[PDB]
């Protein structure tokens, strides 16, 4: 099983940071501790941070959506009623605006209100089917409710897929030095983690759905699944959940090309999705990031809000998190991965675990190494590996080829 080639040379595992924290000047007036970060993005509406731009629902043309909260239908609410000619024109206007100069980066299109496959629209997303029936009734009265509901599915699938394929293809052939992709695709659906006898193993039908959603993967360049966490799970439950999500995200990458699979930039968060103020301790970071470094992903993209990046106390707390927990772990895993490559593979790629249903990881043995901070904030790594570390890695782990270094 091969793997994608690195976008930036001398970096096999890449990090992206997409949050509006570009304003706050960290601590001691130092603006940026982002040396480890190859790509830095800013979602502010007027901002022009090239690295990782992202077009939300409110931009990039005339995207239709019925607001779930009490609100009005916008641009029709269904992909059936859209002009499909003004959309591409305003999208061209937006593409001209948000990247006047062509530069390397990844653009993500954040559109989730409806899902382009029928039968994934259980409550509260049943609305897009209600309307999808009644419109047909307003065109023909011969057909009963059964026939109207049947023909509803043939005015939402075609509509949505012709929407998104074209919204990409005005991006892929125009400014191809960027990396285009939709947010949160694929998905597997793990919501049964409270019932007894829980194993996160995605149910059969969801795998069938994403397997037959194969038309979209042939369009985008990069994938961006979500490996979010909440505080209702247990250690084993969280490990299995993350493991299976990422494993599916890696299996869906075999289809668009079977020799040089895509880049998977795991969209993650450093905050619990149930409590949006409590960070992840190091053990949670293990089965969030280390389970990703150790399964073959091309990199990790973190995401934020303004919830933890507006107040100055928030700036201080995030500065402490960066200087105590996150950056040391980033160097830990990255240096483990680069050492794996250079020693055990001769840099033919990145190494991937033998049996995934296991708690093996890519970490630096504390009895040999020392990751420290010298004065000035530039990290330094001291120490070299022993032979026993390489032996245990070469038994647990194994390597595989790159897309260019086979």
């Amino acid at each position: 099983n091969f793997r994608a080639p690195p976008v930036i040379p001398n970096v096999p595992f890449l990090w992206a940071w997409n949050a509006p924290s570009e304003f706050c000047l960290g601590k001691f007036d130092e603006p940026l501790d982002m040396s480890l970060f190859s790509f830095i993005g800013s979602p502010r509406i007027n901002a022009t941070g090239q690295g990782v731009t992202i077009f939300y629902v409110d931009r990039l043309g005339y995207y239709p959506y019925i607001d779930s909260i009490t609100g009005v239908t916008v641009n029709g609410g269904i992909p059936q009623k859209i002009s499909l000619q003004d959309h591409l024109d305003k999208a061209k206007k937006d593409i001209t605006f948000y990247m006047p100069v062509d530069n390397l980066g990844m653009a993500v299109i954040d559109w989730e209100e409806w899902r382009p496959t029928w039968a994934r629209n259980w409550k509260p997303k049943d609305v897009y089917k209600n309307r999808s029936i009644e419109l047909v009734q307003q065109q023909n009265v011969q057909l009963s409710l059964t026939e109207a509901t049947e023909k509803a599915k043939q005015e939402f699938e075609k509509a949505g897929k012709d929407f998104l394929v074209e919204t990409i293809k005005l991006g892929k052939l125009l400014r191809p030095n960027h990396l285009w992709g939709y947010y949160l695709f694929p998905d597997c659906y793990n919501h049964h983690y409270k019932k007894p006898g829980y194993n996160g193993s995605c149910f059969n039908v969801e795998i069938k759905r994403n397997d037959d959603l194969s038309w979209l993967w042939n369009e985008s360049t990069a994938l961006y699944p979500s490996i979010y966490l909440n505080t209702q799970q247990s250690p084993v439950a969280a490990t299995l959940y993350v493991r299976n999500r990422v494993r599916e995200a890696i299996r869906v990458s075999k289809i668009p090309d079977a020799k040089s699979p895509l880049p998977v930039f795991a969209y993650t968060r450093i905050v619990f999705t149930d409590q949006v103020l409590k960070f992840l301790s190091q053990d949670e970071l293990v089965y969030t990031f280390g389970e990703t470094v150790a399964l073959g992903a091309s990199g990790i993209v973190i995401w934020g809000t303004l919830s933890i990046m507006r107040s100055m106390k928030s700036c201080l707390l995030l500065d402490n998190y960066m200087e105590t927990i996150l950056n040391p772990y980033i160097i830990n895993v990255t240096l483990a991965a680069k050492m794996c490559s250079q020693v055990l593979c001769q840099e033919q790629g990145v190494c991937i675990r033998k049996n995934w249903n296991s708690s093996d990881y890519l970490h630096l043995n504390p009895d040999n190494f020392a990751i420290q901070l010298e004065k000035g904030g530039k990290f330094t790594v001291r120490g070299k590996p022993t032979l026993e570390d390489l032996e245990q890695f070469s038994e647990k782990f194994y390597c595989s080829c790159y897309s260019t270094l086979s």
Partner: antibody
Amino acid sequence: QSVEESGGRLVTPGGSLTLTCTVSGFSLSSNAISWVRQAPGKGLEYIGIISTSGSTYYANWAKGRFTISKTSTTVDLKMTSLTTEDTATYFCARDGAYDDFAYYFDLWGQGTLVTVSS
Amino acid sequence: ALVMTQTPSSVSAAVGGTVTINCQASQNIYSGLAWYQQKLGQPPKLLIYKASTLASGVPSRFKGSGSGTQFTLTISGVQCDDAATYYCQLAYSSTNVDNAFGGGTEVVVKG
């Protein structure tokens, strides 16, 4: 930079001894240091190695007798239970940092002679 | 127990090109194996600082080659200027159980 050994002398069986190795032109936190011995008319034998993080590695024939240490400038070796089998010339080697995950020694010293007799 | 064995222990090859001194092992060693040269009465000198890479200042066009558990150092240009005794050492920080340096090789030149 330079590497210079010292401390080699005459000793009596059953005792203990200490050697020093002095450096100039660099720092001990960026380059590692190794101790090797050579018996007269025989081969080199590996006594130990000191990493950049303070970790000390020895060979299994030497564990329980030998101990290395560092300072701001000098790297010292200390030994115990001296018999007639320990007569040799002791060198001090510096790692020239050709590789990021292995030790390779480029700058050597001159050597100190240790004589064990009654 | 990591045991590294040198054969031969003394080579006698006239002017021309002489043999490649060897080095064996019992635990897998990828590429951390260095070769040194020592004339009598002098400290050694680093010649090959991997299984194959030469250091600056090696005009005798040496070239080492190998990987796995068996390794060699080839003496391409031998004259009355390259007479010494050679050695192989494992380059990774020694495991708990180790034996790094070998039995040594000697070069006899029949001028």
